[PDB]
Each structure stands twice: as structure tokens, then as C-alpha cells.
Tab-separated table of C-alpha atoms and ligand atoms in Angstrom:
chain	number	residue	atom	x	y	z
A	1	UNK	CA	32.970	15.457	-8.039
A	2	UNK	CA	32.445	14.612	-4.141
A	3	UNK	CA	30.797	12.574	-1.601
A	4	UNK	CA	26.844	13.225	-0.915
A	5	UNK	CA	26.040	12.019	2.849
A	6	UNK	CA	22.088	11.334	2.741
A	7	UNK	CA	20.727	11.003	6.101
A	8	UNK	CA	18.461	7.861	7.066
A	9	UNK	CA	15.046	8.622	8.843
A	10	UNK	CA	15.242	6.403	12.353
A	11	UNK	CA	11.528	4.896	11.634
A	12	UNK	CA	13.261	3.307	8.125
A	13	UNK	CA	14.339	-0.383	8.118
A	14	UNK	CA	17.876	0.207	7.004
A	15	UNK	CA	18.652	2.947	9.658
A	16	UNK	CA	17.080	0.438	12.412
A	17	UNK	CA	18.609	-2.742	10.694
A	18	UNK	CA	22.489	-1.006	11.094
A	19	UNK	CA	21.999	0.286	14.615
A	20	UNK	CA	20.785	-3.401	15.187
A	21	UNK	CA	24.173	-5.012	14.006
A	22	UNK	CA	25.873	-1.905	15.853
A	23	UNK	CA	24.204	-2.432	19.312
A	24	UNK	CA	24.187	-6.205	19.177
A	25	UNK	CA	27.478	-6.975	17.731
A	26	UNK	CA	29.085	-5.178	21.538
A	27	UNK	CA	31.007	-7.595	23.682
A	28	UNK	CA	33.250	-7.320	26.466
A	29	UNK	CA	36.857	-6.800	26.121
A	30	UNK	CA	39.718	-8.248	27.845
A	31	UNK	CA	40.990	-4.359	28.301
A	32	UNK	CA	38.432	-3.828	30.819
A	33	UNK	CA	37.663	-1.009	28.723
A	34	UNK	CA	40.384	0.890	28.904
A	35	UNK	CA	40.976	1.433	24.682
A	36	UNK	CA	37.490	1.905	24.085
A	37	UNK	CA	35.444	3.127	26.860
A	38	UNK	CA	33.145	1.578	29.351
A	39	UNK	CA	29.796	1.205	28.032
A	40	UNK	CA	27.338	-1.820	26.678
A	41	UNK	CA	24.880	0.144	24.958
A	42	UNK	CA	25.772	3.609	22.323
A	43	UNK	CA	23.983	6.629	22.129
A	44	UNK	CA	23.472	6.678	17.695
A	45	UNK	CA	23.209	10.217	16.913
A	46	UNK	CA	22.576	9.720	12.992
A	47	UNK	CA	23.434	7.383	10.375
A	48	UNK	CA	24.129	8.310	6.957
A	49	UNK	CA	24.559	6.711	3.685
A	50	UNK	CA	27.707	7.844	1.598
A	51	UNK	CA	27.656	8.253	-1.944
A	52	UNK	CA	30.208	8.776	-3.981
A	53	UNK	CA	30.710	8.011	-7.622
A	54	UNK	CA	34.205	7.428	-8.293
A	55	UNK	CA	34.764	5.216	-4.440
A	56	UNK	CA	31.601	3.168	-6.171
A	57	UNK	CA	33.398	2.558	-9.564
A	58	UNK	CA	36.984	1.676	-7.305
A	59	UNK	CA	34.802	-1.462	-5.538
A	60	UNK	CA	32.725	-2.617	-8.219
A	61	UNK	CA	35.747	-2.787	-10.510
A	62	UNK	CA	37.615	-4.486	-7.799
A	63	UNK	CA	34.693	-6.725	-7.258
A	64	UNK	CA	34.506	-7.802	-10.671
A	65	UNK	CA	38.087	-8.574	-10.764
A	66	UNK	CA	37.642	-10.906	-7.374
A	67	UNK	CA	34.533	-12.791	-8.869
A	68	UNK	CA	36.595	-13.668	-11.851
A	69	UNK	CA	39.639	-14.883	-9.726
A	70	UNK	CA	37.209	-16.447	-6.990
A	71	UNK	CA	35.185	-18.806	-9.308
A	72	UNK	CA	32.413	-15.777	-9.307
A	73	UNK	CA	31.996	-14.951	-6.033
A	74	UNK	CA	33.095	-11.714	-4.299
A	75	UNK	CA	32.484	-13.166	-1.136
A	76	UNK	CA	30.817	-9.360	0.447
A	77	UNK	CA	30.072	-9.038	3.832
A	78	UNK	CA	29.126	-6.026	6.167
A	79	UNK	CA	31.541	-5.058	8.628
A	80	UNK	CA	32.499	-2.284	11.350
A	81	UNK	CA	35.774	-0.037	11.077
A	82	UNK	CA	37.007	2.320	13.625
A	83	UNK	CA	40.227	4.642	12.532
A	84	UNK	CA	41.069	8.441	13.228
A	85	UNK	CA	40.894	8.495	8.647
A	86	UNK	CA	36.784	8.389	8.799
A	87	UNK	CA	36.377	11.754	7.489
A	88	UNK	CA	39.613	11.129	4.697
A	89	UNK	CA	37.697	7.391	3.978
A	90	UNK	CA	34.183	9.368	3.540
A	91	UNK	CA	35.868	11.086	1.087
A	92	UNK	CA	39.148	10.039	-0.599
A	93	UNK	CA	38.036	5.937	-0.256
A	94	UNK	CA	39.912	2.954	1.728
A	95	UNK	CA	43.856	3.540	1.159
A	96	UNK	CA	46.153	0.779	2.427
A	97	UNK	CA	49.087	2.970	1.720
A	98	UNK	CA	48.116	4.459	5.719
A	99	UNK	CA	48.766	1.624	7.534
A	100	UNK	CA	47.047	2.400	10.859
A	101	UNK	CA	47.887	-0.772	12.675
A	102	UNK	CA	50.410	-2.508	10.992
A	103	UNK	CA	52.971	-0.161	11.136
A	104	UNK	CA	56.398	0.870	8.727
A	105	UNK	CA	56.903	-2.441	8.456
A	106	UNK	CA	52.980	-3.663	8.305
A	107	UNK	CA	50.121	-3.718	6.311
A	108	UNK	CA	46.191	-3.659	5.593
A	109	UNK	CA	43.039	-1.961	6.321
A	110	UNK	CA	41.318	-3.659	9.495
A	111	UNK	CA	37.614	-4.568	9.768
A	112	UNK	CA	35.479	-5.974	12.941
A	113	UNK	CA	32.046	-8.265	12.842
A	114	UNK	CA	32.274	-6.484	16.581
A	115	UNK	CA	31.245	-2.916	16.754
A	116	UNK	CA	32.615	-2.797	20.201
A	117	UNK	CA	35.673	-3.852	18.646
A	118	UNK	CA	35.971	-1.043	15.965
A	119	UNK	CA	35.105	1.255	18.767
A	120	UNK	CA	38.800	0.944	20.330
A	121	UNK	CA	40.468	1.877	17.429
A	122	UNK	CA	38.305	5.346	17.081
A	123	UNK	CA	41.000	7.282	18.551
A	124	UNK	CA	43.909	5.120	17.518
A	125	UNK	CA	46.012	2.541	18.273
A	126	UNK	CA	44.749	1.287	21.878
A	127	UNK	CA	42.152	4.294	22.189
A	128	UNK	CA	45.127	7.273	21.332
A	129	UNK	CA	44.596	9.807	23.678
A	130	UNK	CA	41.260	9.568	23.438
A	131	UNK	CA	39.051	12.338	22.294
A	132	UNK	CA	40.707	15.455	20.891
A	133	UNK	CA	38.639	17.663	23.753
A	134	UNK	CA	38.671	16.083	26.678
A	135	UNK	CA	41.628	13.318	25.756
A	136	UNK	CA	39.113	11.101	27.608
A	137	UNK	CA	39.447	7.061	25.910
A	138	UNK	CA	36.003	6.898	27.634
A	139	UNK	CA	34.451	10.361	26.632
A	140	UNK	CA	30.667	9.744	27.055
A	141	UNK	CA	29.960	13.563	25.817
A	142	UNK	CA	32.230	13.562	22.009
A	143	UNK	CA	30.558	12.097	19.176
A	144	UNK	CA	32.486	9.580	18.086
A	145	UNK	CA	32.211	8.183	13.916
A	146	UNK	CA	32.599	4.620	12.821
A	147	UNK	CA	31.938	2.801	9.288
A	148	UNK	CA	29.524	-0.329	8.472
A	149	UNK	CA	31.241	-1.245	5.336
A	150	UNK	CA	30.599	-3.732	2.171
A	151	UNK	CA	34.145	-5.692	2.323
A	152	UNK	CA	34.926	-7.815	-1.032
A	153	UNK	CA	36.488	-10.693	1.181
A	154	UNK	CA	37.227	-13.333	-2.308
A	155	UNK	CA	38.625	-16.175	-0.909
A	156	UNK	CA	39.650	-16.131	2.896
A	157	UNK	CA	42.860	-16.854	4.290
A	158	UNK	CA	41.771	-18.061	7.867
A	159	UNK	CA	44.438	-17.675	10.761
A	160	UNK	CA	44.549	-17.990	14.249
A	161	UNK	CA	47.718	-16.501	15.597
A	162	UNK	CA	49.633	-13.532	16.932
A	163	UNK	CA	51.441	-12.957	13.482
A	164	UNK	CA	50.105	-10.371	10.617
A	165	UNK	CA	51.486	-10.661	6.834
A	166	UNK	CA	51.984	-7.647	4.509
A	167	UNK	CA	50.106	-9.476	1.600
A	168	UNK	CA	47.534	-11.782	1.062
A	169	UNK	CA	48.613	-15.147	0.598
A	170	UNK	CA	48.643	-16.515	-3.440
A	171	UNK	CA	45.365	-17.334	-4.404
A	172	UNK	CA	43.419	-15.280	-1.289
A	173	UNK	CA	41.952	-11.456	-0.798
A	174	UNK	CA	41.401	-11.034	2.433
A	175	UNK	CA	43.203	-12.924	5.433
A	176	UNK	CA	40.689	-13.537	8.723
A	177	UNK	CA	41.935	-13.543	12.784
A	178	UNK	CA	39.819	-15.923	14.439
A	179	UNK	CA	39.494	-16.525	17.824
A	180	UNK	CA	42.488	-13.709	20.079
A	181	UNK	CA	39.141	-12.755	21.104
A	182	UNK	CA	37.142	-11.729	18.522
A	183	UNK	CA	37.388	-12.190	14.528
A	184	UNK	CA	39.439	-9.376	12.440
A	185	UNK	CA	39.030	-8.885	8.592
A	186	UNK	CA	42.004	-7.808	6.864
A	187	UNK	CA	42.466	-6.370	3.571
A	188	UNK	CA	45.168	-5.035	1.728
A	189	UNK	CA	43.611	-2.664	-1.214
A	190	UNK	CA	41.652	-0.288	-0.538
A	191	UNK	CA	38.866	-0.812	-3.378
A	192	UNK	CA	38.109	-3.812	-1.471
A	193	UNK	CA	35.823	-1.902	1.198
A	194	UNK	CA	33.123	0.638	0.746
A	195	UNK	CA	32.331	3.158	3.466
A	196	UNK	CA	28.585	2.202	3.248
A	197	UNK	CA	27.298	3.879	6.141
A	198	UNK	CA	28.602	6.663	8.951
A	199	UNK	CA	27.399	6.020	12.151
A	200	UNK	CA	27.758	9.342	14.323
A	201	UNK	CA	27.498	8.362	17.947
A	202	UNK	CA	27.982	8.292	21.773
A	203	UNK	CA	29.109	5.365	24.174
A	204	UNK	CA	27.054	5.046	27.084
A	205	UNK	CA	27.592	5.422	30.957
A	206	UNK	CA	26.099	2.909	32.832
A	207	UNK	CA	23.307	3.739	35.468
Q	301	ZN	ZN1	35.497	14.350	25.172
């Protein structure tokens, strides 16, 4: 009835692939490192595949609906996600009723093609107050977690603005904020993402 976490072995292609996506999509942030910390590399502690029958059924069911509405293309992408909700997501799935980033009049679940972007939201908006233990947004000690996710984008609506909506526009299934400094991918239904890989990691302190 629950989630099985399967550990990948570091010598497997699949683990190496996930780390490669993670390490290589790091970019400099306009922050100067304030929200996510100062680093140019991660220390990857563990990578786990999340398996949950119920999460998978909801994802696959929505994926078929999107294909039908999108000339038989679900338009799936692998994308990164960071939020303080990681533990609830791997057990309960993504839930849009948490409007982590939007607000009390905002909506949408955010993903990034750049892992360093997702890492800014691991402790909250603007990096919250940092790690629970040390209250350090730039903690090199505490193990952080993020997700590398299957995301059903369907027909994406592209925008280039400091604006954001509370649903996808007519005909569409996701919203892309284009560079902004980096791209952001927004979906408005939780069943449009599956939390494939759970990455446990530290940011590294430069020498
Ligand atoms: Zn800490």
C-alpha cells in the first residue's frame, strides 16, 4: 500500500545518468548564492527510485488523458523539483492544493531543468530559514533532498514574464516561463508529475 525506495548502485548507468543531469545543469544564480548556498558541485549521498502503485496509476491515468487531448503526445520531460514537501510527495504524490510558490491566490507546482534552481526552494521560498538544525541556507553539513521527476507537459503555454496564472490556458496542460534567468515548468495538477528519483545530497564548499 506504500512506497518502496529502491537504492541505485553508483556503478549503474542509471545512477550515473541522474547525477550527470544533476551536476551538469548547475548554473550561477543572480542571488550570489543567497537562497540555495554557495557551491559549484554537489556531494551526492544516495539516489533512490520511488515506487508506489497508487502514485503510478494516477500518473498513467492522467498521461493517457493528456495524450488524447494532445494528438497522442503526452510530452513528458525529466525535470527537477525542490520543496520542503519532499517526504509527503514520495508517499502521497504531488498535490497542487499546496500552493508552495504561488500563494493564497496563486497556484501551480514548479519544476526546473536546472538542478541548482530547484535547490533554492529545498528549504522554502528564498531558501526559507535554511536547514532545520543550523538555520543556514548555505549548510554544507546537512543532507538535502530533491526529486528528478517525470512530468507530463502536454501542450505547453510559453511565457516570458514576471506574471503567473492559476490554471493552464485553454487547450494547454502546462506553462513554461522562459528566460528570467532560467526556465521554469508549471503544472496545475499533481498527477501530471511522478517523483521518479529521490536524490539525497550536500552542496559542496569551494576550496
Ligand atoms: Zn545544517
